Assembly symmetry: D2
Homo-oligomer: 326 residues x 4
């Protein structure tokens, strides 16, 4: 059966698309490390993750070939064997390409697509709404996770957009960003499970504990124990009213993220989103994300140190929380 | 079939749309190019005396055509031209490998070059953008490249040092250029590129540097090419005689015809509706049938349409006036 | 006598306009403050039970008042308040020396602090912004400072490390804050500041950190303060009982009342017409007379005015509803 | 005696800084203008053969001077010039009434006009900006106005229809203009304005429209004016002979000298440090002493200073080269 918002809870981890050593070279044709892909999936399931996202920005949806995408998703689906829900990503330059990709990946066995908007031309509100309506009409069995990334996709996913999305049954969740208007968006869109970024989960769950039961994590790719402990401790906090431990975990997470952005600058992070994320994962040692596919295969060396330091900090959190999970 | 150089790029270079069938706005439609209208436009342009044809930029719907549509369009163009004028396809895509794949196939069909922007899901930086064009030229050495310098679409702003680097790539022979504020410097930085100003700026640019600025790009020609042909011819005469009055009068007419195109005079608003507004203007002018916009960019606020249609009628009026002078 | 601290900043902090005479849009006019309306507003706010008064931000026309107008306005406010609640003037200006000059005079008249943005002709960077506030606090050590964190007006975006630096400055006691996306972090970075969310965000912010988030800033109160007072009171009760449903209902009402204020829902357009839109809404609500805008910001597209006036009527309706629930 | 018109605006128009005393970065300092260096600069510029003097834009620290400093600076300039060349003060301020007050006093002291941007705390729209300049011209009919078209400082972007409206205001005679992308159209829309391109763009602009483009604005001249004077003279000759090669060579030298000024080639970064970078370049060139920056804009990242200093040296080298060619 198609996933609903009710079925979206806990720690939703966004995995990279592991690269072979030659993946930066435009001459290379099959650059997905399929075995590393399988290994990551089993490790996430074993850690107790609730669901898997993939194929956003750092997941290199932009720079994988179609055959690579099909092979990656096939490997994921075969590994999961129905044990947890899985979202592919099918953001593309036009509605027809999105539909083509979405139908094929769902057919292979993804449960849904994490889906941004076509971005060559900046979409307006009615265009963006009709785009998601078109995809849901065309592929009614796909769940949709709204990939609300204004830097990548130009459109800024405003309040009235969320009100419209809540009328589309297929739209069950959102990879959400800053929580300044989460309170209102929750009211406007009762049928969506809004996923804050892991660092914001603490605050969001305190805003609305009934609705905010899940979050998205990239930090888990440096070791998932931290995300699992946050999940578990927030459940306990909601029951006991004692938020101190959840707050301590959340504060540790923000510190670990503190060096990721070049000079603390998000616009600079946005330019190097792929390389910085993959470098941090490589430095953490929990998985091998590998080289970036062209064109986004060059990152200023000085920016790499901050990403690597963040990776080490998250690895240290994973060690610490692994022990607290016993 | 030896590779175009900047020396071969002169006069009026007209950018043609990709004509749509009546059902082209519907995501269910699979073969939406009117191939006969495509052939008719090409022959008409050749008959008008155009120097070269560009295609498959933003309003040309490079973003929203399917690959089979693209191949069919280019095939029809190549068969129609039968080597009589140079022809640039467009192969801007999400990643370097896809660009290369598309560029190889379209050049193989018989385009002379590609009008090429940069991958834009993630904003490129300077060295990434340089290496991208180096990679394409390395991979498809037989393709001429026209730099499609559109910062609104592609995020990257095509700065001074970028032009210096492009001038070292023999395949890069021209640029679909925008504002001329830094044209004087860019000409010095890139001696081996024929910079094409937009037609409305050709008068000013040709006066800046009459030796280098011998060509321009025209979308207004899709409303009747006589105006562009007369501008071209009169600028040649002005360069010889030193009497720029007639060239100036034509150029001023062109700016007036463009004056209602932008919604509330706002370029950011034009950028969002670049496809629909251009196609609507052409439809209003009656010289060709551009037809409906492919999804998702198939909705334009009604009030913005009037300005585009008025511009189309103004350009049609120019074409009638200048037809009588040629 | 002693300088305000964060501990003294609680509850509903209402930001008042600078009432205009009928001729206030004309550059020829010289004394455009309705000083009696100013006095009447202050007494009405105190009577409603407001905890403190802010003034002289953007809609308060700090940019467009003359210096004599500012001195007369503040004098009237100080003499009306008679020490009963704390009061912040505003002294944002083009340079540090002018800020200091204005701050010293208005504090001397008897304001307790200044609600202060940064000089904005040139976009400030982080170290220059920090040193600016250090310089003002050094020069006028008796002034409390409310950081006026408005990136649209002031260009500087008031980032995380800025708040960490401000928390080392004893004079910096509060902030007129905006979106709460990084409030959790900012609270950790700046233990010594009372961060004031906008009233519509107070519900969410108070649930994030009920210990720290005890106060908020209100412009809706200028359309009738009962709603803000009710929100204040009900959030105190929610923190004690754990039952947040009534506070949530009031907060939801407030957001609905604000829903038509921004032209086509666009904040960049709101930013251009911040003064005229706020003053028009207050005029429509009928609780006070904000009056015409001082030049140059005395023209607002007519279509944008209806949305502001509708918001003013919605807030007036809330005030009537909550007045009855208070009493 | 009579008000300047566009017809009177020709040649090299040099924008001078406001020379600082050594203590000028300290907010405690009250009289930070080096009035003798001011007088020296003015006489040097006149001696070099400059056609007019502009002052009190961004790097000229209109935003950070006190009023007494501004009056003293302008008084010194007026008494030095003794009517020999036209002089524009600058009176950009936060509101129309302040602009008018300042403009009346500085024109009264003896400036011929004001180089005037728009109030920028709130981003102006088109009709507001137009009415602002109408208001100033109505209030101070004897002042010539130079439109200071700086969208980074003033937020408003000075669009095509704005120039059409300005051409109906007789007092508006010139513009300190930026990029020339739409100069061709703006010239058509505003026949009564002498558009001043930046010196590096003068070559291109003069080739676009040699009848209209007869003047330019120079900051490079503050590193030695010979280059600007030679550009001016050689462009006159080019227009007569049709031989543009020498003008092109001078213009290309100017662009090279500017090539290191912007931090990492980034204009947004230049905009933040516009004051410090310009003053540092002038200090490095050695032709005049611009001196420390008034607060708050008194801190520039050290790495950015080297690029400004290198530009100053390059301009000084051009001044030496062209001094010899004028002889």
């Amino acid at each position: 059966s198609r996933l609903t918002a009710e079925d979206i809870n806990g720690a939703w981890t966004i995995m990279p698309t592991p690269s072979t050593p030659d993946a930066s070279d435009w001459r290379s044709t099959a650059t997905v490390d399929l075995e590393e892909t399988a290994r990551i999936v089993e490790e996430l399931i074993a850690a107790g993750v609730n669901g898997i996202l993939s194929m956003g920005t750092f997941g290199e949806c932009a720079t994988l070939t179609w055959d690579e995408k099909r092979d990656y998703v096939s490997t994921i689906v075969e590994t999961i064997r129905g044990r947890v829900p899985y979202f592919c990503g099918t953001t593309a330059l036009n509605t027809r390409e999105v539909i083509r990709q979405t139908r094929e990946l769902i057919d292979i066995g993804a449960n849904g697509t994490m889906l941004g908007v076509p971005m060559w031309v900046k979409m307006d509100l009615p265009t963006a709404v009709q785009f998601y309506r078109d995809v849901a009409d065309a592929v009614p069995e796909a769940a949709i996770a709204i990939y609300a990334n204004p830097e990548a996709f130009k459109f800024d996913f405003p309040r009235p957009f969320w009100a419209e999305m809540s009328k589309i049954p297929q739209v069950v969740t959102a990879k959400y960003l800053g929580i300044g208007m989460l309170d209102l968006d929750l009211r406007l869109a009762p049928n969506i499970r809004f996923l804050p970024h892991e660092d914001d989960y603490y605050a969001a769950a305190r805003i609305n504990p009934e609705r905010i039961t899940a979050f998205w994590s990239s930090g888990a790719m440096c070791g998932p124990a931290t995300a699992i402990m946050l999940r578990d401790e927030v459940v306990r906090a909601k029951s006991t009213g004692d938020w101190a431990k959840a707050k301590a975990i959340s504060d540790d997470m923000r510190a670990a993220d503190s060096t990721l952005f070049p000079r603390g600058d998000f616009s600079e992070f946005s330019k190097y989103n792929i390389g910085l994320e993959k470098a941090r994962m490589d430095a953490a040692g929990w998985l091998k994300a590998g080289p970036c596919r062209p064109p986004y295969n060059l990152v200023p060396e000085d920016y790499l140190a901050g990403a690597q330091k963040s990776g080490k900090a998250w690895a240290a959190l994973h060690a610490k929380y692994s022990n607290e999970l016993k």
